[PDB]
């Protein structure tokens, strides 16, 4: 008999139902987000970090470190091969 008032009732529930769950999921991660490679930490030195940076990095990612390890184990084992036989 009178005029009910829909057009300003969105205060109680934000428009949409499915994207409401994703709103909180995607709005919160943008605060603590790296602008462009912040704190890359590409430089380190712990007597083995240089080897990791030079060979164990994703830029090369080749089979050369495995061959170097094989050569090193051969060099180490030559001495005890002489010692045993």
Partner 1 sequence: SVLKNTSVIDKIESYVKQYKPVKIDASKQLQVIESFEKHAMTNAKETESLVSKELKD
| 14 touching partner 1, by CB under 8 A | yes
- How many other CB atoms are found less than 10 A from the CB of residue 65? 15
| 1 touching partner 1, by CB under 8 A | no
Rounded-to-integer distance, Cα 9 and Cα 13, Å: 8
Q: How far is the CB of 8 from partner 1 (least distance, A)?
A: 4
Identify the sign of the CA torsion 60, 61, 65, 66: negative
Per the listing, tokens 């990095």 go with 57
| 27 touching partner 1, by CB under 8 A | yes
Q: How far is the CB of 11 from partner 1 (least distance, A)?
A: 4
- Contact residues for partner 1 (CB under 8 A)? 2, 5, 8-11, 14, 27
């Amino acid at each position: 008999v009178s005029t009910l008032i829909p057009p300003k009732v969105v205060s109680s529930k934000n428009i949409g139902s499915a994207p409401n769950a994703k709103r909180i999921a995607n709005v919160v991660h943008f605060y603590k987000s790296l602008p462009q490679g912040p704190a890359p930490a590409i430089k380190a030195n712990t007597r083995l970090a240089r080897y990791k940076a030079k060979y164990f990095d994703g830029d090369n990612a080749s089979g050369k470190p495995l061959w170097h390890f094989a050569l090193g184990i051969i060099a180490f084992g030559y001495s005890m091969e002489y010692y045993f036989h």
